[PDB]
Design a protein around this ligand. Structure first.
Ligand SMILES: [Mg+2]
Ligand SMILES: [Mg+2]
Ligand SMILES: [Mg+2]
Ligand SMILES: [Mg+2]
Ligand SMILES: [Mg+2]
Ligand SMILES: [Mg+2]
Ligand SMILES: [Mg+2]
Ligand SMILES: [Mg+2]
Ligand SMILES: [Mg+2]
Lengths: 171, 51, 183, 147, 48, 114
RNA sequence: GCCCUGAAAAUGGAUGGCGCUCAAGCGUGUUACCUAUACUCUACCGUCAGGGUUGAUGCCCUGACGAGUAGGCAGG
RNA sequence: AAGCUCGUAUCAGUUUUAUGAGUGUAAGAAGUCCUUGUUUGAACGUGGACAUUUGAAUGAAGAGCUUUUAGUGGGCCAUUUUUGGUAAGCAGAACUGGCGAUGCGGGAUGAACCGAACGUAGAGUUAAGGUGCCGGAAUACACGCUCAUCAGACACCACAAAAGGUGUUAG
RNA sequence: GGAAUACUGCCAGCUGGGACUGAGGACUGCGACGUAAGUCAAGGAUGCUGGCAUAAUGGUUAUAUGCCGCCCGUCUUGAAA
């Protein structure tokens, strides 16, 4: 669906002589909190030796974009599950929000790489402060000063089956 | 002879629950809470904003 | 519960709320082609036809049954308003092995008065707070016969997990929206 | 579709009615149906059930068996009730004075009881005398002894 | 079979007094009986 | 390590009949060399009774009823104690219950991002 | 990742047909919509079950069910 | 199908706990206490007594024992375990489903595919599959990819050597 | 620093439009509004009005249209094959 970002903080169950186990936080992109918690347990078991049965979720909070009406460039570092192994991929996405950039990235992985949400891992989404660190041409072409472009061949949606006039594509 | 849903029939609702009259009169379905000025800790804010 | 969460954040801590003590379960798949062990567990939870629902007290003994019948149910944590609307609209009692509608407080007093339950609101209380007589109250309630959801299931394919875009399994708090659509 | 946990349309049975076409037997069944419904007495329940039994399940009760039942302590003045036929027995030489209620008496059995000094009464006479079956003793004859 | 860890007792052994004996012991006795019978047959061929 | 008739044993090898590994049965026959074991096996819709003969080192005394015996003793003792000192006691086992609320402190335990 | 080649016989024929090219193709996401003898509610038939009742193998009240070959029982 | 019983009786294609194995067994009247009798100890007893807080969860109104006879018993397909294999198909075991006796919706059509099992109707809502037209239902919205001198809309098996290409896109 | 709004949830909040159904047949019950006598949407539809009064509604029959429907019985897994 449309993505939200959550911080999920969990821990092992306290035992005898071991109070206050270490708290682990993870940033998860998901459609809702049930999916977010599921992905968190998946990664915690994949990385450490912690199971959902032996642990608990301490906190889960939605994280909002700080400046959702500011256009930013994002470097996205991902890796996808494969027979040859984990494969790094770096992409650049221009958008106003991290969740919008991640939604674009998932749609793009489905379109080009034929990849699914369960197969894609997000390693890091970072905002590029300076425009000189942008290094993909399909993003750098939109960083030109006084950028103006037209939209040739305008196709207007018709509400009726028949039109009494030949259409125009002018804009 | 005929089952009447108390969620739609007010007489049946009042027959089953005498407190529904008090609830409607006091507007307890729209009760306002007292406001407090409790502030979260800076450690919570830093952990929430942390990457 | 709300203020405790506010005080925990103010003191730099985290309030971890108590685990849910009650689930509501709805059978989602039909009676054709069910493996034997899940079929038996569905019968033991009294989900004998599609869109039949029951309340289950959460213990370690019951979580494993839910795990066994996961591909054929949708279940979650019901809210008080969901329980109340279920009991008011589709609440029927098992009296002398017959399905008797709960249209008066006298029927409930005559059948559950030995456990201190005098009215439909007392029954609702005993369900929501999983009390000492939860087993008796819950078995007194006849299994709920829900309709298909009024707006649909929201997915093209029902028989995948709720996490993977389907319908079955634990959907936690979203069971309230689903059951209110089905009620 | 419903996954039935039990068999559908299953009869309880329990021999609801007698299989005879005897008008007098149907009258007695009607009377004890009324009594078993309107008294809540287990005696009337037992009598109503025994009125439905088949012939091979209603074996005769002898006067010697009745006398042996009467020899029990505290039971000398009770009315003996046999839902069936009371037959005579030449192997016994002394018979007490008692009242017997039965569907049928053989001529020898009735003569022996009346000679001893009691009376042979019908089950409706018993119904009037003891509408709850007070001070009675129901006797059943041997089952396995026929084959 | 003498060193086999587990043997299932045949149902034909029921109804007899040989039910309680070890099947390995029964097989050893049968083997020795066959060998001694072979020796007796050799002795008979020798006498002929 | 003496086995008698009616004793309950577990089958454990220290090649054939690999089905009867971890099955539990009842001793019916004890000789100088072997032990007879009664086993209930599922054949169709009805259990069938089988006689197995094992070596001594391939079985051991089973501990299946030990919890039941200890619980019976403890229940009798606790019921007697509650009879002596008039108080309400609970003697049935319970399933493991869901946990209660708690406050988790980040005092020295500041959560770390993976 | 998508595309082309990566072998084919032999009456004229097939993504079911028409046809479709920023698709009416392919991958994915969000909603709306269509309709099974399935699910919910109501009526009616029959069957079973539980009750009540001084034309009584009748009457009344209540609940739940209804696939079916060989075969079985029952009422016509 | 008939009887005798019992009916907090008898249980259960399920979980839990304990205890084995790498799915088995057990969880109370077919009990338990004191009292010291049997060949200082195992194993059986003399006599009394403790309940509706009689020994996990969930469900269940029928259960047990006796008699009592119509029709049928070598089938096909699929899933999961094990052992051996072939140019390749596969072959021997064990357990579990589906079908024959069975209609209905969908997959254009159909033994084993996807939904769902069936009294007679009305109304509402859906499943699977779909919504250019045939045909009920958006020539909907959104991000990308592809132009094939017989594309594709397919079975995820084979052709297939992850081979060939100055097609094109992103790593 | 102080507001607003989205999102999610709740109300025994108010209210407009459409469709199908009207089983039961003296009373008895649980309730509600009233100080009260009474009244009510509370153990299942009544009130008011019009036209027609016969082929008008309906049935039957011959057909037309849309969609569905292979020839039965037997015998063999199975059969249009
Ligand atoms: Mg709709
Ligand atoms: Mg669908
Ligand atoms: Mg049905
Ligand atoms: Mg199409
Ligand atoms: Mg598409
Ligand atoms: Mg159309
Ligand atoms: Mg070829
Ligand atoms: Mg007409
Ligand atoms: Mg046709």
């Amino acid at each position: 669906a449309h993505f939200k970002e959550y911080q999920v903080i969990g821990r092992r169950l306290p035992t005898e002589s071991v109070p206050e186990p270490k708290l682990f936080r993870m940033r998860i992109f998901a459609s809702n909190e049930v999916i977010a918690k599921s992905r968190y347990w998946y990664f915690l078991q994949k990385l450490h030796k912690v199971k959902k049965a032996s642990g608990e979720i301490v906190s889960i909070n939605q994280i909002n974009e700080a400046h959702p009406t500011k256009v930013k460039n994002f470097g996205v570092w991902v890796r996808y599950d494969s027979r040859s192994g984990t494969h790094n991929m770096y992409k650049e996405i221009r958008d106003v929000s991290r969740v919008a950039a991640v939604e674009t990235l998932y749609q793009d992985m489905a379109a080009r790489h034929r990849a699914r949400f369960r197969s894609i891992h997000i390693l890091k989404v970072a905002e590029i402060e300076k425009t000189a660190d942008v290094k993909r041409q399909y993003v750098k072409q939109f960083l030109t000063k006084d950028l103006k472009f037209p939209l040739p061949h305008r196709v207007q949606k018709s509400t009726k089956t028949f039109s009494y006039k030949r259409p125009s594509t002018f804009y | 002879v005929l089952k009447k849903n108390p969620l739609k029939n007010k007489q049946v609702l009042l027959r089953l629950n005498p407190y529904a009259k008090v609830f409607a009169a006091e507007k307890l379905g729209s009760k306002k809470a007292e406001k407090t000025g409790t502030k979260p800790a800076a450690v919570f804010t830093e952990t929430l904003k942390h990457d | 519960i709300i203020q405790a969460k506010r005080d925990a954040k103010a003191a730099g801590s985290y309030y971890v709320e108590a685990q849910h003590k009650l689930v509501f379960v709805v059978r989602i798949k039909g009676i054709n082609k069910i493996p034997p062990k899940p079929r038996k567990v569905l019968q033991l939870l009294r989900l004998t036809r599609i869109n039949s629902g029951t309340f289950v007290k959460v213990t370690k003994a019951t979580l494993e049954l839910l795990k066994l019948i996961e591909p054929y149910v949708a279940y979650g944590y019901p809210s008080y308003s969901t329980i109340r609307q279920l009991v008011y609209k589709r609440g029927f009692g098992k009296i002398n092995k017959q399905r008797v509608p709960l249209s008066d407080n006298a029927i409930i007093e005559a059948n559950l008065g030995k456990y201190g339950i005098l009215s439909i609101d007392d029954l609702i209380h005993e369900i929501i707070t999983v009390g000492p007589h939860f087993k008796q109250a819950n078995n007194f309630l006849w299994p709920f016969k829900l309709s298909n959801p009024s707006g649909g299931w929201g997915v093209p394919r029902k028989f995948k997990h709720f996490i993977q875009g389907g319908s079955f399994g634990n959907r936690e708090e979203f069971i309230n929206k689903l059951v209110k659509s089905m009620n | 579709g419903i996954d039935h946990t039990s068999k559908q349309h299953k009869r309880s049975g329990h021999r609801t009615a007698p299989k005879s076409d005897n008008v007098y037997l149907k009258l007695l069944v009607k009377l004890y149906t009324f009594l078993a419904r309107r008294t809540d007495a287990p005696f009337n329940k037992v009598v109503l059930k025994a009125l439905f039994l088949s012939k091979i399940n209603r074996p005769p009760v002898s006067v010697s068996r009745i006398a042996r039942a009467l020899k029990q302590e505290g039971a000398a003045n009770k009315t003996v009730v046999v839902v069936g036929t009371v037959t005579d027995d030449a192997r016994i030489f002394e018979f007490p004075k008692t009242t017997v209620a039965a569907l049928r008496f053989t001529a020898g059995a009735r003569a022996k009881i009346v000679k001893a000094g009691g009376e042979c009464i019908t089950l409706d006479q018993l119904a009037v005398r003891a509408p709850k079956g007070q001070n009675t003793l129901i006797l059943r004859g041997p089952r396995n002894s026929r084959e | 079979l003498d060193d086999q860890w587990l043997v299932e007792v045949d149902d034909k052994v029921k109804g007899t007094d040989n039910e309680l004996i070890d099947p390995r012991t029964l097989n050893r006795a049968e083997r020795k009986r066959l060998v001694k019978k072979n020796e007796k047959q050799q002795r008979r061929n020798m006498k002929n | 390590k003496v086995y008698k008739v009616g004793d309950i044993v577990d089958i454990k090898a220290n090649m054939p009949h690999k089905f009867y590994q971890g099955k539990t049965g009842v001793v019916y026959n004890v000789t100088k060399s072997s032990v007879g074991v009664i086993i209930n096996k599922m054949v169709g819709n009805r259990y069938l009774e089988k006689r197995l003969n094992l070596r001594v080192e391939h079985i051991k005394h089973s501990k299946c009823r030990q919890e039941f015996l200890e619980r019976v003793k403890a229940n009798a003792a606790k019921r007697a104690e509650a009879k002596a000192q008039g108080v309400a006691v609970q003697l049935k086992r319970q399933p493991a219950q869901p946990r209660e609320s708690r406050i988790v402190s980040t005092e020295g335990n500041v959560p770390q991002t993976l």
